[PDB]
Amino acid sequence: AELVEIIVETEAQTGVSGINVAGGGKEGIFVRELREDSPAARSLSLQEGDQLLSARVFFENFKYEDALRLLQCAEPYKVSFCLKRTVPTGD
Amino acid sequence: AELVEIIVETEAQTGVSGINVAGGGKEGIFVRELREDSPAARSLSLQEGDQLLSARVFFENFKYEDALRLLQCAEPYKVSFCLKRTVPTG
């Protein structure tokens, strides 16, 4: 009974990370006040007060500089990658 | 002998640096050089020439300004969040 929390995976979109966030450290990162009627808001997924567990960032059409900056930014933290590779043999 | 393509999601690891990349844009991002002795080369999760489709960054113990810099950096691109929300029961 009592406390129940839903874990949601939002639909990947462009410009949804332009939100404002709060907290940090061991507290966690939470979404602060939603800017008015922006694309990030109008997607029914993201809401004020939500705790962000993780961000999945897609490298599609990425500027090299921005890739470097992103990686540099996430270096000290916990990160997993989704990669495409070519070799044998896993049969 | 026969070459094939695989998509891999690496095991989440904390503090992986030493990843050097090349390319961008319509081409995409590729792993070029794994820095010697870096936690990246000791991770073995990554190989050179591999394309990075996406990076999943965890907000566990994240310092505020770093999270800011991250989201600022990712604004022009495609992003999905994994979030936790409370409900009425529900």
JSON list of C-alpha atoms in Angstrom, two decimals, chain B:
[
{"chain": "B", "resi": 1, "resn": "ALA", "atom": "CA", "xyz": [35.52, -13.78, -41.13]},
{"chain": "B", "resi": 2, "resn": "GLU", "atom": "CA", "xyz": [32.07, -12.58, -42.19]},
{"chain": "B", "resi": 3, "resn": "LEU", "atom": "CA", "xyz": [31.52, -9.03, -40.94]},
{"chain": "B", "resi": 4, "resn": "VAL", "atom": "CA", "xyz": [28.22, -8.07, -39.30]},
{"chain": "B", "resi": 5, "resn": "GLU", "atom": "CA", "xyz": [26.78, -5.09, -37.38]},
{"chain": "B", "resi": 6, "resn": "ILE", "atom": "CA", "xyz": [25.85, -5.13, -33.68]},
{"chain": "B", "resi": 7, "resn": "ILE", "atom": "CA", "xyz": [24.26, -2.60, -31.34]},
{"chain": "B", "resi": 8, "resn": "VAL", "atom": "CA", "xyz": [25.70, -2.65, -27.83]},
{"chain": "B", "resi": 9, "resn": "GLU", "atom": "CA", "xyz": [24.52, -1.00, -24.62]},
{"chain": "B", "resi": 10, "resn": "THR", "atom": "CA", "xyz": [27.57, -0.84, -22.34]},
{"chain": "B", "resi": 11, "resn": "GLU", "atom": "CA", "xyz": [27.38, -1.68, -18.64]},
{"chain": "B", "resi": 12, "resn": "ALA", "atom": "CA", "xyz": [26.92, 1.50, -16.59]},
{"chain": "B", "resi": 13, "resn": "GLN", "atom": "CA", "xyz": [30.24, 2.53, -15.08]},
{"chain": "B", "resi": 14, "resn": "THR", "atom": "CA", "xyz": [31.06, 5.48, -12.87]},
{"chain": "B", "resi": 15, "resn": "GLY", "atom": "CA", "xyz": [33.80, 7.91, -13.83]},
{"chain": "B", "resi": 16, "resn": "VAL", "atom": "CA", "xyz": [34.74, 6.82, -17.33]},
{"chain": "B", "resi": 17, "resn": "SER", "atom": "CA", "xyz": [37.05, 9.33, -19.01]},
{"chain": "B", "resi": 18, "resn": "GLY", "atom": "CA", "xyz": [39.76, 9.04, -21.63]},
{"chain": "B", "resi": 19, "resn": "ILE", "atom": "CA", "xyz": [37.35, 8.65, -24.54]},
{"chain": "B", "resi": 20, "resn": "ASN", "atom": "CA", "xyz": [38.58, 10.45, -27.66]},
{"chain": "B", "resi": 21, "resn": "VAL", "atom": "CA", "xyz": [36.21, 10.82, -30.60]},
{"chain": "B", "resi": 22, "resn": "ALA", "atom": "CA", "xyz": [36.13, 11.99, -34.22]},
{"chain": "B", "resi": 23, "resn": "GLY", "atom": "CA", "xyz": [33.56, 12.97, -36.86]},
{"chain": "B", "resi": 24, "resn": "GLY", "atom": "CA", "xyz": [30.13, 14.49, -36.30]},
{"chain": "B", "resi": 25, "resn": "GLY", "atom": "CA", "xyz": [27.07, 15.83, -38.11]},
{"chain": "B", "resi": 26, "resn": "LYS", "atom": "CA", "xyz": [25.51, 13.63, -40.79]},
{"chain": "B", "resi": 27, "resn": "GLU", "atom": "CA", "xyz": [28.38, 11.16, -40.26]},
{"chain": "B", "resi": 28, "resn": "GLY", "atom": "CA", "xyz": [27.92, 10.88, -36.49]},
{"chain": "B", "resi": 29, "resn": "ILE", "atom": "CA", "xyz": [30.33, 10.39, -33.59]},
{"chain": "B", "resi": 30, "resn": "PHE", "atom": "CA", "xyz": [32.92, 7.61, -33.55]},
{"chain": "B", "resi": 31, "resn": "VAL", "atom": "CA", "xyz": [35.37, 6.34, -30.95]},
{"chain": "B", "resi": 32, "resn": "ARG", "atom": "CA", "xyz": [38.89, 6.97, -32.20]},
{"chain": "B", "resi": 33, "resn": "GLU", "atom": "CA", "xyz": [41.41, 6.90, -29.35]},
{"chain": "B", "resi": 34, "resn": "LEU", "atom": "CA", "xyz": [41.16, 5.31, -25.92]},
{"chain": "B", "resi": 35, "resn": "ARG", "atom": "CA", "xyz": [43.60, 7.16, -23.68]},
{"chain": "B", "resi": 36, "resn": "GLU", "atom": "CA", "xyz": [46.23, 4.90, -22.12]},
{"chain": "B", "resi": 37, "resn": "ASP", "atom": "CA", "xyz": [45.70, 4.01, -18.45]},
{"chain": "B", "resi": 38, "resn": "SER", "atom": "CA", "xyz": [42.40, 5.93, -18.44]},
{"chain": "B", "resi": 39, "resn": "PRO", "atom": "CA", "xyz": [39.36, 4.25, -16.83]},
{"chain": "B", "resi": 40, "resn": "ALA", "atom": "CA", "xyz": [37.95, 4.04, -20.37]},
{"chain": "B", "resi": 41, "resn": "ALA", "atom": "CA", "xyz": [40.72, 1.73, -21.57]},
{"chain": "B", "resi": 42, "resn": "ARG", "atom": "CA", "xyz": [40.48, -0.27, -18.33]},
{"chain": "B", "resi": 43, "resn": "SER", "atom": "CA", "xyz": [36.71, -0.52, -18.77]},
{"chain": "B", "resi": 44, "resn": "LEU", "atom": "CA", "xyz": [36.97, -2.63, -21.94]},
{"chain": "B", "resi": 45, "resn": "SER", "atom": "CA", "xyz": [33.34, -1.63, -22.62]},
{"chain": "B", "resi": 46, "resn": "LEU", "atom": "CA", "xyz": [34.49, 0.51, -25.55]},
{"chain": "B", "resi": 47, "resn": "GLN", "atom": "CA", "xyz": [36.45, -0.13, -28.76]},
{"chain": "B", "resi": 48, "resn": "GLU", "atom": "CA", "xyz": [37.89, 2.16, -31.45]},
{"chain": "B", "resi": 49, "resn": "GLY", "atom": "CA", "xyz": [35.95, 2.76, -34.66]},
{"chain": "B", "resi": 50, "resn": "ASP", "atom": "CA", "xyz": [32.73, 2.06, -32.77]},
{"chain": "B", "resi": 51, "resn": "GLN", "atom": "CA", "xyz": [30.02, 4.62, -33.41]},
{"chain": "B", "resi": 52, "resn": "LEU", "atom": "CA", "xyz": [28.37, 6.18, -30.38]},
{"chain": "B", "resi": 53, "resn": "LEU", "atom": "CA", "xyz": [24.63, 6.12, -30.99]},
{"chain": "B", "resi": 54, "resn": "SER", "atom": "CA", "xyz": [23.72, 7.55, -27.61]},
{"chain": "B", "resi": 55, "resn": "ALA", "atom": "CA", "xyz": [25.05, 8.21, -24.14]},
{"chain": "B", "resi": 56, "resn": "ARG", "atom": "CA", "xyz": [22.89, 7.59, -21.07]},
{"chain": "B", "resi": 57, "resn": "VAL", "atom": "CA", "xyz": [24.06, 9.91, -18.30]},
{"chain": "B", "resi": 58, "resn": "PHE", "atom": "CA", "xyz": [22.95, 9.15, -14.73]},
{"chain": "B", "resi": 59, "resn": "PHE", "atom": "CA", "xyz": [22.08, 12.03, -12.40]},
{"chain": "B", "resi": 60, "resn": "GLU", "atom": "CA", "xyz": [23.15, 10.10, -9.29]},
{"chain": "B", "resi": 61, "resn": "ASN", "atom": "CA", "xyz": [25.34, 12.37, -7.11]},
{"chain": "B", "resi": 62, "resn": "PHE", "atom": "CA", "xyz": [25.44, 14.94, -9.94]},
{"chain": "B", "resi": 63, "resn": "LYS", "atom": "CA", "xyz": [26.69, 18.41, -9.05]},
{"chain": "B", "resi": 64, "resn": "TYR", "atom": "CA", "xyz": [24.29, 21.17, -10.07]},
{"chain": "B", "resi": 65, "resn": "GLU", "atom": "CA", "xyz": [26.40, 23.23, -12.51]},
{"chain": "B", "resi": 66, "resn": "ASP", "atom": "CA", "xyz": [27.50, 20.05, -14.30]},
{"chain": "B", "resi": 67, "resn": "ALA", "atom": "CA", "xyz": [23.86, 19.06, -14.86]},
{"chain": "B", "resi": 68, "resn": "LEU", "atom": "CA", "xyz": [23.27, 22.57, -16.14]},
{"chain": "B", "resi": 69, "resn": "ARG", "atom": "CA", "xyz": [26.23, 22.44, -18.52]},
{"chain": "B", "resi": 70, "resn": "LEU", "atom": "CA", "xyz": [25.00, 19.03, -19.72]},
{"chain": "B", "resi": 71, "resn": "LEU", "atom": "CA", "xyz": [21.40, 20.02, -20.49]},
{"chain": "B", "resi": 72, "resn": "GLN", "atom": "CA", "xyz": [22.58, 23.30, -22.01]},
{"chain": "B", "resi": 73, "resn": "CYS", "atom": "CA", "xyz": [24.91, 21.29, -24.22]},
{"chain": "B", "resi": 74, "resn": "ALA", "atom": "CA", "xyz": [22.21, 18.82, -25.27]},
{"chain": "B", "resi": 75, "resn": "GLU", "atom": "CA", "xyz": [19.41, 21.33, -26.03]},
{"chain": "B", "resi": 76, "resn": "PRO", "atom": "CA", "xyz": [19.78, 21.40, -29.84]},
{"chain": "B", "resi": 77, "resn": "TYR", "atom": "CA", "xyz": [19.71, 17.56, -29.98]},
{"chain": "B", "resi": 78, "resn": "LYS", "atom": "CA", "xyz": [17.36, 14.61, -29.37]},
{"chain": "B", "resi": 79, "resn": "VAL", "atom": "CA", "xyz": [16.96, 13.68, -25.71]},
{"chain": "B", "resi": 80, "resn": "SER", "atom": "CA", "xyz": [14.89, 11.23, -23.67]},
{"chain": "B", "resi": 81, "resn": "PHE", "atom": "CA", "xyz": [14.69, 11.24, -19.88]},
{"chain": "B", "resi": 82, "resn": "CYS", "atom": "CA", "xyz": [14.14, 8.41, -17.44]},
{"chain": "B", "resi": 83, "resn": "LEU", "atom": "CA", "xyz": [12.19, 9.96, -14.56]},
{"chain": "B", "resi": 84, "resn": "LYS", "atom": "CA", "xyz": [10.56, 9.02, -11.23]},
{"chain": "B", "resi": 85, "resn": "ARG", "atom": "CA", "xyz": [7.10, 10.39, -10.29]},
{"chain": "B", "resi": 86, "resn": "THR", "atom": "CA", "xyz": [4.71, 9.81, -7.35]},
{"chain": "B", "resi": 87, "resn": "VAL", "atom": "CA", "xyz": [1.07, 8.77, -7.90]},
{"chain": "B", "resi": 88, "resn": "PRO", "atom": "CA", "xyz": [-2.30, 8.67, -5.97]},
{"chain": "B", "resi": 89, "resn": "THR", "atom": "CA", "xyz": [-2.47, 4.81, -5.65]},
{"chain": "B", "resi": 90, "resn": "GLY", "atom": "CA", "xyz": [-3.43, 4.39, -8.28]}
]
